[PDB]
Each structure stands twice: as C-alpha cells, then as structure tokens.
A paper describes a structure:
PRMT5 plays an important role in the regulation of diverse cellular processes via dimethylation of target proteins involved in splicing regulation, cell cycle progression, apoptosis, the DNA-damage response, and other functions. Due to its involvement in these critical functions, PRMT5 is considered an essential gene. It has been shown that PRMT5 inhibition by small molecules can selectively kill cancer cells with homozygous deletion of the MTAP gene if the inhibitors leverage the consequence of MTAP deletion, namely, accumulation of the substrate of the MTAP protein, methylthioadenosine (MTA).4−6 MTA is a weak, endogenous inhibitor of PRMT5 that binds competitively with S-adenosylmethionine (SAM). Compounds that bind PRMT5 cooperatively with MTA, and not with SAM, can selectively inhibit PRMT5 in MTAP-deleted (MTAP-null) cells and kill those cells while sparing normal (MTAP WT) cells, since normal cells have functioning MTAP and therefore low levels of MTA. Targeting MTAP-null cancer cells via selective inhibition of the PRMT5·MTA complex can improve tolerability relative to nonselective PRMT5 inhibitors8−11 by limiting inhibition of PRMT5 in normal cells.
Numbering used by the authors:
A (entry chain D): 27 to 328
B (entry chain C), C (entry chain A): 13 to 637
D (entry chain C): 13 to 315
Write the structure that this text describes.
Amino acid sequence: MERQLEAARYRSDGALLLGASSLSGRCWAGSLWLFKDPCAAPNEGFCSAGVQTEAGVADLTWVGERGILVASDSGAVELWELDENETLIVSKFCKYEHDDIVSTVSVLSSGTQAVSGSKDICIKVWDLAQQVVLSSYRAHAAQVTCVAASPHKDSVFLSCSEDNRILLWDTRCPKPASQIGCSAPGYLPTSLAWHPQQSEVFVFGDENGTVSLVDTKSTSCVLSSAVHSQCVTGLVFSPHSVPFLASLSEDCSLAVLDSSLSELFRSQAHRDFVRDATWSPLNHSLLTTVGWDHQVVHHVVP
Amino acid sequence: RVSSGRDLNCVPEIADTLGAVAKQGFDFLCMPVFHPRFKREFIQEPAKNRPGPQTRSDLLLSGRDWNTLIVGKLSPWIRPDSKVEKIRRNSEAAMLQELNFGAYLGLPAFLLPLNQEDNTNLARVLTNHIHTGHHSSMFWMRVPLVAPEDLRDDIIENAPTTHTEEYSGEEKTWMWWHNFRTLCDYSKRIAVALEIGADLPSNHVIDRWLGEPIKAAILPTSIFLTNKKGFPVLSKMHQRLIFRLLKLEVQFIITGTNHHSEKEFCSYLQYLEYLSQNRPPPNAYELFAKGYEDYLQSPLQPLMDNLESQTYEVFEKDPIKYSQYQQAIYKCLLDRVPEEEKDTNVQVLMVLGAGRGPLVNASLRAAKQADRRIKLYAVEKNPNAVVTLENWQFEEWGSQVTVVSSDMREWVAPEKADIIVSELLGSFADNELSPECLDGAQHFLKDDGVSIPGEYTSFLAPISSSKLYNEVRACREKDRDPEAQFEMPYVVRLHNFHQLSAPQPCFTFSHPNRDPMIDNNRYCTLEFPVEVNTVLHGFAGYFETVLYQDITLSIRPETHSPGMFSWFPILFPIKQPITVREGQTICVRFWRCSNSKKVWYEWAVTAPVCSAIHNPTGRSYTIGL
Amino acid sequence: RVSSGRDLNCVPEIADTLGAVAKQGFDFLCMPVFHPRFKREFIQEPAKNRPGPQTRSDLLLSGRDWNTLIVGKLSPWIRPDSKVEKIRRNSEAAMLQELNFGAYLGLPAFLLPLNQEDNTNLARVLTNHIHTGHHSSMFWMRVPLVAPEDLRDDIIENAPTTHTEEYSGEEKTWMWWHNFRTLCDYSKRIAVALEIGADLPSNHVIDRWLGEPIKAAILPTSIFLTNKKGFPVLSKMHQRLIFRLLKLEVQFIITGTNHHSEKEFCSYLQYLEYLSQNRPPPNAYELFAKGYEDYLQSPLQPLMDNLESQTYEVFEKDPIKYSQYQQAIYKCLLDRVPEEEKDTNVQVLMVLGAGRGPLVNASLRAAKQADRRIKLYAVEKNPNAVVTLENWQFEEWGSQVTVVSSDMREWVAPEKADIIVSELLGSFADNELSPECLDGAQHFLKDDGVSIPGEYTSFLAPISSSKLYNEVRACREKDRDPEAQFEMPYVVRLHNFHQLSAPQPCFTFSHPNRDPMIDNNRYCTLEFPVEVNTVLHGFAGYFETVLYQDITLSIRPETHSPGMFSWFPILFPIKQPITVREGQTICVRFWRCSNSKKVWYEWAVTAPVCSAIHNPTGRSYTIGL
Amino acid sequence: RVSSGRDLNCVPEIADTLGAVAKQGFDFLCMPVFHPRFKREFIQEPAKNRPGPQTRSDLLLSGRDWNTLIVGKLSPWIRPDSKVEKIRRNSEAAMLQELNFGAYLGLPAFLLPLNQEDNTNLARVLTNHIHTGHHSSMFWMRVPLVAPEDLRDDIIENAPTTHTEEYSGEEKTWMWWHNFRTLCDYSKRIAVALEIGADLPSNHVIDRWLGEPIKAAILPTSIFLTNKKGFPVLSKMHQRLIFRLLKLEVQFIITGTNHHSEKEFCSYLQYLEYLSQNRPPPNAYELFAKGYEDYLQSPLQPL
Ligand SMILES: CCc1cc(NC(=O)C(=O)N2C[C@@H](C)CC[C@@H]2c2ccc3sc(C4CCN(C)CC4)nc3c2)cnc1N
Ligand SMILES: CCc1cc(NC(=O)C(=O)N2C[C@@H](C)CC[C@@H]2c2ccc3sc(C4CCN(C)CC4)nc3c2)cnc1N
Ligand SMILES: CSC[C@H]1O[C@@H](n2cnc3c(N)ncnc32)[C@H](O)[C@@H]1O
Ligand SMILES: CSC[C@H]1O[C@@H](n2cnc3c(N)ncnc32)[C@H](O)[C@@H]1O
Ligand SMILES: [Cl-]
Ligand SMILES: [Cl-]
Ligand SMILES: [Cl-]
Ligand SMILES: [Cl-]
Ligand SMILES: [Cl-]
Ligand SMILES: [Cl-]
Ligand SMILES: [Cl-]
C-alpha cells in the first residue's frame, strides 16, 4: 500500500473502505481497499479486497453498498463497482470531464446523482446511472476546496472554495448558487459538514483552525470556536441522535465537539496530517481516523 | 511550425508520461516537481519531521531531459500572500524549496501563478531567489487574460455579475503582472505565460499585452469547440488571437484533460499546426528581416566612419529603391532636356555619395531609358569604396564617369551640376547629416539645378514595449553613464510593440536651400492623442523622402514603400517608463542641435508627465561632421 | 587533423590562386591586399596624385570568402619605424590604408611583421587603428623563432658570427614581441605567428614562447629535408616542435616556393597531416578536458552554495577516485576489526558530505570486500541531494544506511563513529573549508577514530601565461573594483602556460586534530628557484591527500593520480606581471585568514620584486562558513 | 540674524549702487549684467553688427566682489519659449550670452524667471549650459507663490476672475517648477527663489513648497503694509510665512522701489531683522542639532 492514506469510510454493515495515494517517490499512484476486518487495517495481508489505480485519489465516498466514487488526480471521476463475491474491485466507469485535480466528491440524497468539485474552479453534477454530466457550473473564482451534498434534498448542496465563498445550492432555481456571508469576510473555508438532523444548520472549518456553526435561516455566524492550531481538513458528525462532531486538521490532531462546539476528546495519536475519520455503525462511540503517517487509529469516545 | 508543450498536474510515472507526451508530438512538458497535494510543514512539529523522500529522484531523467524538456510548476497549495501569518511563513519556505529544487535540476523554465491583485510577498521571495546564486533560470508567470472572478457564470442569486462598462477594470489582470513586474525591477528572467479563457474580452484588453514578454500562451481543452466529425476547433476570434500570438513566436501550452475522447491528444496540437501551416508564406521582406526582429543595432555613421564592404552589399540588394531612383532621374532628364536637344544638350549629373556604384549604374540606365546625354561624376570619400568605383570605371564605364575621391563639402568642382543624386538618408532621414553634406555640396549646383532627393521629412510615434525597454536597459556598459543607453537611438526592426498614436512629422529638409540664413537646428513639439491606457517606453522614428515629383521613398508604416529593405525604423527610448491613461495626450519635444563638429538630438516628454531632457549637449550620442 | 593555410607574396589572379590553394587542400591563404612592390606616396606631388585603382576590387570574392579564406599581409615596403622622417610619415599613412582596407573586406586576420628591436611607431599606429572603429579584427605578428641576423651564414670576412655563449641574446626575438605586446597594452586582438627557421635554437629559446598567444606557426619549404623517395620531411627536433605546436592547436602556414619539384604542393601539407594522424590517441582525461582548456571558472563553494545535479554527476563519473576511496575504507576496516570479530564487531562509518551517494556505495562495496559489518550514516546538508539519498535508501540501501539531512557542524549524533569519510577537498585542498567542517564534526568521532582523508596538503608553483593573464584581465565587471578579478582564484584546466619552478607544499591539514589550540589560519613563505628568463603572471595550485596509509590522491602534475578527472588546477593571479631573469628566485607569501563567518586567502610576491597584497580582508574573494 | 540682498533692475553706476546697498545693510545685490532694455540681435543684419561694448566692464569690481556680492539676472526681454521662431532662436543665443558672462564673472548665483507653464526650451538651454564647462555656478529660479493671472484684479468686464474652488489649479506655479526641475534631471545647481505676492493662497499651496530647495524668498515693497508712524510692516499671515521661511534659513531679497518714502531703505530690512530677533531662542536640542540639519549619515552598527 502507498504511504499517504486519504479516505476512511465505514459501510453500513461495518466494513471499512480505505483510499490511499503515494505523494512521493518514483510512482504517484493510488489504491482502494476494503477491510471486512476493521482492526486488520492498514495491513495489506489481512485484507478483504484491493485494487491499484493508475493515479492518486483525492476524495472518496460510498455509493450505496457496492459502489465506490473516486476523485482522481488525473481530473477524472471514477466509479468502481464491487464484485459479487466482494473480493475484487472493478472500474465501472472513468470519465475525464474536469480539467484539473478533482479535490472533492459527494453523493446526493437520492444515491443516483453526485456532485464533484475540482481545482479547475468548476463544480459538476453527475448522473451515476447514465454516466454523464448533467450540469457544469463555474460559480467560484478559485479552486473548489469542498462540496457537501445535503442529506435530505437531492437538489441542494454546499460548496466552498479559496475565493472565500460559501455557496448554498438549489439546482431547481435559475441561479442555483447563493452566497452565505456568515459573519463577514473571514479566513478561507476548507471543510463543510451538514447537520444530520436539522437541514437548516451546518458547520464549516477554516484555514486558521476555527470551526463555525451557521444557520441558513439567520444567515449569520451563530457560533465559532478556535479548535485547532492549523487548517481544518474535515468535519464528520456522529450517527447518534445527539450528534458528536469530529474535526480533523493539519496540526496532526483530532477533536470531538458537542452541540456547543466544546472540546471533549482529543488524540495526538497521528504524527502527520489527519485526512479522514468515520464512525462505526456497529458501535456509535468508536471512531476510526486515518492520516499520512499510514496509521489507522481507532478511538473510543465517552 | 509550432513549438509546444503539454501542461499536466498529474504525473504517476515521469518516464511513461514523458514518453506519452513525446509520442503525442509535444516539445516539452510542464509538470510539478513535488506532488501537488503533498503539503509540507516547516515550523510546527510533528509534521515538520515528516520522513523523506520529499519528491521523486533526479536520477529518473538525464541531465539533457531536465535541461530541455521539463518545465517546473509551483505547487498550488503554496500561498506566500495569505492573510494568515502561519501559512505565509510556511509558503515562503515551500516556494524557496521548490524553486531551489527546480534550479538544482537545471530546468529551463519554472511556472508561477498570478491570480489575485496582491502578489507582493511572492514577488519578494522570487526576487530574493533570483539574486541568491545567479543561474540561467527562467520564470513564466501564469497570468489569465481574464480574471477568474470576471469569467464566472452569473449563477449566484445574491451576487450578480455586473453587466455595465468598466474599461480599466477589464484590464486588471495586466495590472497584476505590471505591479509584479515592477516589484522585481524588470528582471529579464521573468516573463508571461498568458492563459486564455473561454470568453475573450474587448480588443483593448488583448492589445494591452502588446509589447510584453509573452513566452508562452496557455490554451485549455475547455475552450475548444467540437467539430461535426468530432475534432477540436476554435472560434474565429480565438483563431485571430492564435495568429497574433504566432507572429510573436510564443510557445503554446495545452492544459486540461481530453474532452474530445474519441480522438487522441494529437488532435489539439494538430489543429494548432494546421492553423500555423495555413498562414500566408513569408514574403521577401519578412524572410530577410525575420532574424532582425527587435535586434538593437547602433545607427551607422557613413560620414564619420567608412562603411565596410558587406554593408554596401546589403544596401545594393534592394531593387525597388534603385528602380525608384532610376525613374526619378529619368523624369528629371525628360523635364530638363527637350526632345529637339537630345544630341546637343549634355547634362552634368553628380552622384554625391556613390558607394560602390549602384546609383551610377542607375543614372546610366535612366539616361539610356530617357534617350539623353549625361556626364557622370561619382563622388565618394570612402577610399575603400573608391577602389571599387575606379575598378568599375576602368573595366566598364570608361571616361563617361569621372570618379572623385574626396568629400563633397571640400571638393572644388571643375563644372557645375545640372542634377545631384544622393543616398545620404538614414532611418530618421537626417540622422546621417544629409542636410549638412548637401549644403556643403550646394555651391557647385547650377542656379536652375535639381537635387534628388528634393525633400525629406522625419516622423515620430509613441510606442509601448516593455520588451524593448528592458533590452535597452540591459545595454549598460562599464566606464560610462549608467543610463547612457537610454540617451541614444537604435536602428531596430520593431516587433512585439504597440504604437500609441498615429505618426506625425518631426523635421523636414529641402534641397537646394536658397535661404540666406541657413540653419539646420530644429525644435519641434508633438501632441499625440492616445485612445488606450498603456505605458510609454519610447518613440519609433521613420522618414519620407521625395526624390522627384511623385517618386518617393518611405519607411513610415502608412506610406511604406513595398518590398524595400534598406532602412529599419529607429527608436528613441526614455529612461523611466511613463503611465498613460485613455484620452490623455503624449506631448514630446525634439531638438536637432549642432556645433562646428557634432550634430545630435535632444528630446523630452512633457505630457502627460515630464521626463528628463535626454542626451543634453550630446553627452551620450553625437553624429560627427 | 590540421587547419592550415598557404602564404604567397605573388597573386596574379586572385580567383585562380584561391582555387589552386583550395585544390591543394589548404584552408586559407595569406596574401597581400595591395601589390607588394606597388609603393604609394601620400605627401609629395606628383606621385601623390597617382590615378587609381590602388588595388584589386572587393567584388572579386564573396563576403564569406573574405571572412573565412583570406588573411591580409602588410606590404613589405611599409616601414613605420624608419630612421627617415619622410618614410616614417608615408609608412604611417600606408599602414593605416592597408589595415583599413583589410577591415573593410572583413578579413579574419591580418599579418604584420616583427623583424627588428624597435617597433614602437608600428605599435602606436596599430594601437590607434584598434581603438578607431573597433571590429572583430585579429592581428598576427610575424616573429621569427631566430632572428635573421643570428641565422645568417658565417661568410662575411670582416663580420664573423660569434660562436660564444649568450643566453639572453638568443631570446631577443621574444623580447621584441614582449615589448610590442606591452606597448599595445595586452590587446586580445594581437597574437603571434611564430616563424620557424632551418636551425632550431636551444630548448630555452623555444620554451620562451610557452604561455604566449600563438595562433599560427609559419613553416618555410626551405626547412624541409628531402626523403629517400623524394618527399619532404623534417628533422626529429622539428617534429617534436610540430607536436608541441599541435597541442596548442595552432594553424600551420606554408611559405616559400616548391623545392621538391617532383611532387605537388600537396606533399608538404600531407606530411603535416601524416604527423597529426600519427600522434597518440586522446586519453580519457584529455578527451573529456579538451574543451576545458584554459576555461576560467569560479571555484565551487559546496558549503555556502548547494550544488546543482550535473555537478554531482561529473563528480560521480570518476571511477579511479572512488576505487581509491573504496580501497582505503577496506584497509581501515581490516586494520580496525580482527578476523575473529568479523561477526561480533560492527563499525560506525559516517559519510560526511554524501552528495548523491557514491561514497555510500563505495563504503558498502568496501565492507563486503573486507567481509566486515558496518552501520552507515549519510550526512548531507544539501536537501536536493538528500532527496536522491533518501530515494536510494528507500529503494536499495534499507535501514543499514541512515540518511541525515543537516550540517555536520550542527548535527548531534546518536552514536560516535569509528570512521568518517569525506570528499570536501577542492583544487587547493582546503579552499572549500574541509578543515572547519571536519573540525566541527570531530566531536562525534571516537577516541581511536579514523578520518578518510587523514591528511591533505596544498602545492603552489609560479607560472607564466600571458594568455591566462589577459583572460583574467578581461573578467572586469561593472559595479566593483576594476582589479577584483586579479584578487580571486579560478579553477581552470591549465594549458598554454609555463611552470617556472617545481611545485612546493603550501598548507597542510591533518584529521583528526587533537590539538587543544586549534587554528586553521596559515602563513607560508615560498622561495621558487627560476632557471630561465620569463614573466610571472600567477601561481598554479594543486593538492595531494592521504586517505589512508599508502592510498593517496593527487592532482599535482608530478604525482598526479592517473585517469582522475574530478579536480582541475587552481590559479591565483597577480595584478601586474613581474619580469624574472635567469637565476633569480621568486619569493611569494600566502595567508589563510578567517573570522567567524568567512575564510579567504591573501598573497603577495616579495621577490624578485614586491607586488601588492592581493585580496586584503577578503575584499574581493571570501569563502563562506 | 538675517542674510539678505537687494533686487534692482536699474543700476546707473555699479559702484555707487553697490555702496548704497552696502550702507543700507544688505549682504548682496541682484542686478542685470546687461541693460534690461538693451535687446540684441544675433541673426539678421544690420542690428547683428551693433558696435560694442555690449555691457559694462568686468574691471569695475574686484574678483571677490563678483564672487560674493553680485547675483546676475536674466534680461526680461529674453524669451526662449516664444511661439515666434525668430524670437526663440534669438533668445537662445541671448540667454547663452548672459549665462556665459555670468560664469565669466564668477557670480555665486544667477536668477532666471518662471512665469508660464511651458519653459521647456529655457530648461534645454540652461541644461546645455550647465553641461558645457563645469563650474560652481548656482541658478535661482524665480517662481511666484501665486501665478500673475490668479493674482490680477477682477477689473476686466468680459473676463471675470472665477470665484470657485480649484485645488490643483491653485498650485500650478509649483507644477511649473516641478516640470522644469524634472526637465533638468534634478540638477543640484538649480534652486528656487520663491516670490511672495500681496494675497497669500490657501495653506496647501504654501505647504506644497515643503521639501523643495528654497534658497531665496523674494519680497516686494508692495506687500508691506504701512504703520501708523509710517514704517513698513506685514500681515500676521505674512509674518507666519516669514517665520516658516526663517526656519529653512533662506535668504530674503527685497525688490521694488521705496514706497514708504519718509524713511530709508533700511526700514524693510529692519522689520525683517526685528522679526528674526523676536523669535524664541534656540533650545538645547536645536542648538546641538542645528548643524546636523539634513546631514546624511550612515547608521551605526555597534554589534
Ligand atoms: C540605403 C542607404 C542607407 C541605408 C541605411 N540603412 C540602415 O542603416 C539600416 O536600417 N540598416 C538595418 C538593416 C537593413 C541592416 C543594414 C543597416 C544597418 C544599420 C545599423 C547597423 S550597425 C552594423 C554593424 C556592421 C558591422 N560593424 C562591425 C558593426 C556595426 N550594421 C548595420 C547596418 C542607412 N543609411 C543609408 N545611407
Ligand atoms: C570530487 C569532489 C570535489 C571536486 C571538485 N572539483 C572541482 O571543483 C573542479 O575542478 N571542477 C572542474 C571540472 C572537473 C568540472 C567540475 C568542477 C567545477 C569547478 C568549478 C565550477 S563553476 C561551475 C558552474 C556550474 C553551473 N552553475 C550555474 C555556475 C557554476 N561548475 C564548476 C565545476 C571540487 N570540490 C569537490 N568537493
Ligand atoms: C551609400 S551610404 C552613403 C554614402 O555616401 C558617402 N558619403 C557620406 N558623406 C559624404 C561626404 N560628405 N562626401 C562624400 N561621400 C560621402 C558614404 O561614405 C557612403 O558611401
Ligand atoms: C561531494 S562535494 C561536497 C559535498 O559535501 C557537502 N557538504 C559540505 N559541507 C558540508 C557540511 N558542513 N555539512 C554537510 N554536508 C556538507 C556538500 O553539500 C556536497 O554535497
Ligand atoms: Cl500596453
Ligand atoms: Cl497581444
Ligand atoms: Cl516628405
Ligand atoms: Cl620598420
Ligand atoms: Cl566578497
Ligand atoms: Cl510637496
Ligand atoms: Cl514652505
């Protein structure tokens, strides 16, 4: 396996999905892995399925239970299908419609469409069944840092880029994008996370290590907390009814926050950037994190 | 054809990628030297101590491949101008690391992006890197023709793209470059990689880049329209732009993924080649003067210096101008000698400045074409050319031509001349002191005599060319004024520049000059209307001469004699470039001064802002009598 | 092979003569531009007004033929230094005329003769011509190896040729040149066309011309001996001289009529070609360094500057030196670890200054050759080479090699080293500050530890090379001391020079240096015996180094390691050349100074005459710590 | 106190005039080297051949007097920037003649006027004169604080003086200087002789000249108000300006005839001296650092 682990996503039945890349050395490629034994990761020997991609992987997301959506460095969006035996991983399609690196992907609520953001300033909507791009938007003025599909609406999603714009979308509207000024022109947004229960509320991290809670109704920065010392790379809510919020950062630390953005758990276990973190559907207090130190850490949250 | 390269931000195997782009026909490859997403920390632990290797090894390619085929790219996560202090300090070290590794590989060029107004700290770090160990490193500044904010789709509900006119704002992307280019003190190792988008702006936004050091033009695959068969093509405006760029001889860089997936990557490059081949082939003038494009040469001084042989040789290879001289002499002969006196009236015809004898042969051909008698004098002060003249006179001309080896201002003629034919003009007409020479030679001209040329006039026009400005600036020599190179003209085949106003006449001389109070000193003021914002760097100079009646010669672009390649335009630069806005008027002053020994030009801009008086007392440039 | 030309003083038809000399195989032709017997008067009438043409026309050849094939010759009747005033002024005018015509033709070279002691006015006129309308014109000074007076037959009754010893007089023909060369202030456009006579003088008279700009060697047909078959050949001494000249890559010029009349003119040129082919083929060292002959380069500073990739590459392409290092490490391993401890005793072996890892591989090979265990540290402060080191360590070396990316003077080692291996030496041994680096790295060396190299020593030798002196003189740059180029050393493959005394050791350093009062400052005085008359222009510098016991490296010409091409010699020049006579001793002083930040060399000649102290306070050259 | 000079355009006897201005207390005298109305022709005959002498002799004063006491003045008829080509060519030679004679006398300074926007050819001729034989010659550019057009009385019926605000226009007289100063490439031998009028402009027009090489301040007798006793005084704003100029240590030049005819010429200079003495005496800081005013020194490096 390549050193730099990028994505860790739990499947509903408990299986863990890993997406890794090699960001140094002779080869700059990537790989996908499925582990039905979670504690066996990242060891390639005790593995359930594995595949080597031509190029690295920037973001990753599940498509149901057998589909794996990949944003590639090659500018491609790639759908890999899982084998009948769930021992092989085969490329269902690989479309080169983005010009630069595809840096983020997110599946819409219906599970039949997806949204992708790329370093080519563009954002693209995809019909996964037809394997085509329905809509292509150029709403930002800098590289798109994150796209996050709404869990409840198939026409709504959030996006954030280095042009300091946070955009709420509604593909039904003629002008789908809408800028959320929050408080006032602050630091660049880097991560987005919808609230699982309330559809009017979300959270975003910035490059200065601050995580903020915003309500679209009030269109104003409801809350903000200086959680990390460096850029915030990911925000993932817990599946429980009372949602815990895991925050990742380039300071090599993980933080767990409550409703009021107060710090609960904190792990210095990673000695490199923390890339992804997913909660186990079999134990809603277990949280699996990955990083560029090739380390897969399982945390127990009180 | 086209020199070109492929821009990729994804390189899994450097050897396989290079082989692929070579088989696709590309000449070079722009690629990242570190992985684009592999952000690095230089201050705070633990990521500070990330174990290497930090990138791929330099052994994977030969030194020649690094030197010729690989163009480095700054990683997109490096933000030297971030409002966050931590990110700024970290990106400083990251940019230094990547630039130092690019120089370590010996790469011919390194791409750095400009996509906001404030690139001050980026410019500071790059300027410090340039002055830390002098190398042959070149730097291409990726500047978009249209800013990404002014290219976005109008799909934001509460942030609409304003549909109103903004002249200066539409050019902001150049301002960026300009400021950056000014912050680095006009480094010759910093150039432009102009990126072209889907929507092309107004023609003035494009003309803005005239006179700028554009080494590369970046075309994405997104801007290519699809053909009926499925091939990639471009709009007619994009094609006009491609031709304009091909004239500047820039390298074209394809970026983005292949969207015309039925074909190969060869299709985009093939469209570019097909455009390049289907351009009108080079005419004789452009064919000869293609190598002289923007080549700075000092003005010749045929009076003070004796010209070499090959200089006269390139003068003689110009059939258009000698045909013009022959026709003028023919018409003058017909107008002076009636038909009933063709065998009784012989004309005294003196060639003042004969060279190696092209004007003598032209006079003979005109005489036999007009069916008249002429006695020829070939006056030349260059004895090395007098050798050629006397060999010609012995072997061919005979006693009809009398060779006179002296200066026309000193020669005591045995008889007075009906016609005097001279070739003493320069690029600025009188910059080689034809007025003084023909004035000294005027006493042996008959009272009803004719001078060919009968008149000449100089023309000036303000130009913008940061390229030529930096070329002049690089002419600083030891043991003289550090700014003397700006206070002297240069004969140059102008290219990659921008005329800012229509040429206007400067100085005019007439021969013969019956005036009692003869004075060749001149003082002229010129007001040039400017319709566009730009930066004045100097003044182009041309001339027009009337040889006889409607027979004229000219290098002035509007009335340029077709196919004549004896003179190139001249250039009077200025020390400091002058910002000019739309509607402003460039007012320039020009003096032609002289004493007993020297003649020189002084000039100074008075509007929209004053400059220093250039070449005062001819301290930097003089023309010897 | 040989580039050559034919010298003729009789040219009836220039085209026929050029075609003949071309079909004979010659590359160029030395011919008069005016008829040799056609004396011209410039002052007194009536001959002053002689009707032209004064010579043949410039139309008779193409510009390329004038530029490449024709070498001009000064007419023999021109005597600028005549005792008669009239002849002096007339010859001034004629010499100016002929030189100006040669420049008008664009000739690549122009021959002027030196055949007496006083050529002062000739030098004055030529110097004025050089500084009047400067072109790329080159001038060959025809100087005979032996004066015609000292070659004449002893057939004058009342004027016998003295058969006694005169060391200085036998070299008078060089003095001529020297004086002339000094009068023209060492013009780069003035060179030597050494004419070789029948009798060759003593070896010192010939060695006099070592270090002089010899562009041409003139051979007459009279000096050629006749072969058994009837072909022309030369004596063994003449052939030795021909080989010595071929090393300098001079052009050979045949003069005189064909005396071996049975054959063609091809025979002389064919003998020269046959000599050129039958020379020992180029050795690898000379093959690589042929292009570097007398090329001045600034010394590398691997400590202050991070070296580029291809520099490390040329360092690694040297199998002899790495074989030597491997053998030294092998012997040290054997001497430190007994046979009965080969599997129990593991050695700490630190490569300080690892580069891209040739010494690491050498250490591994030496370990497996000696059958011993080693743990390797690869210390390197250049991060760009640390990239290569870490790629090697990941892909090949494994955990056996630990790469350390820091300075050896700052690194806090985890364990102490049994052996430390370094290649921090320069051309002058310590000019790259190997002593300071190895002193800072000495604390993590074991009490009984070994340093490879264990010792090194620098060597100096006075040299004579007006060529290299003028090359250094031409390194003057704007914005600094006009004489700073003389106060700094240059790494250069020495060629066309003359060592004046056997090299003597200058500075010596030993590692480890257990001395309590460590001081790397040095002050050395050197007395070099000189057996010949010459002119000191600078001091060549070499080094020897003991890596371990009898394993040594050396660029010193006497003990030079065979086939090693990692270092070229160094050169410390002086501002003013110093005349040295036979028997005199050149006493030079050298200082190695330093402060907290910089190390530099100061030097000054004290005998036979004092010079200025060069590079005081390192004002012109410093080596950064 | 005050270093000062007297500006006269009428000098019948140079010795008598110099003695008079010396007895009046002045330190120098600005006077014409050629008669102001004695226009000369350099091209067209017959006036081209006007018999000499063209001016008074250089023997009439000692070399020291020429070096220290006499400031030359360009004749007012010389118009190098005239729209008429003949007048332009003639004034070029006239200006060269007068400048060369001033340098021949070894005068410490030479006054030249700026009273229009276009002084380009004037600047060209002066720049050529500066670079023709290097001397210690200094040149004072007479620039009015307010242009004569913006100072005239509103007494023209069909050409009224506009009573509206114009910020940049009110400073035009500096622009002139600036352009001139830029055309001569910032010559150290070219300075300002700021002329002060009756009406003082806005404070920004005055502040404009902060940081400019003002060597002389020209005061006419017309701007002096009359005292109850009959002496000459100035307004409070004029006095503030005089203090500001005294801080810069400029030389004050009195021009115009004596209008307070009951007194002598000593009265104007006495008012200036009385203003200079009645200024707060130098404190310790200014006393120590008076010589260090605008003295460039490299920064110390005690480490
Ligand atoms: C028709 C009559 C005529 C023509 C001209 N025309 C020009 O001068 C002119 O535009 N060009 C530009 C182009 C056409 C080439 C020719 C000539 C030009 C200009 C500048 C230099 S410098 C230079 C080097 C020569 C070798 N040496 C050792 C160093 C100086 N050679 C040239 C040659 C001027 N005068 C008269 N009378
Ligand atoms: C074995 C270990 C070793 C060797 C040496 N040897 C030398 O230096 C030396 O003799 N040569 C001469 C020949 C063999 C070639 C290599 C090297 C040399 C010297 C001077 C310069 S200047 C230069 C330019 C490069 C391009 N950049 C942009 C500008 C500077 N490149 C060189 C290269 C010194 N030190 C140590 N440690
Ligand atoms: C054809 S370029 C102009 C020619 O006129 C010659 N020429 C220029 N000035 C004079 C002069 N005053 N008298 C004679 N020939 C001249 C030059 O030497 C050159 O051959
Ligand atoms: C093989 S050329 C000399 C090598 O030693 C390295 N070097 C020189 N001085 C030091 C030092 N003080 N610490 C570490 N490496 C050094 C240089 O970077 C270069 O790679
Ligand atoms: Cl422009
Ligand atoms: Cl353009
Ligand atoms: Cl005309
Ligand atoms: Cl002689
Ligand atoms: Cl230095
Ligand atoms: Cl100001
Ligand atoms: Cl003020």
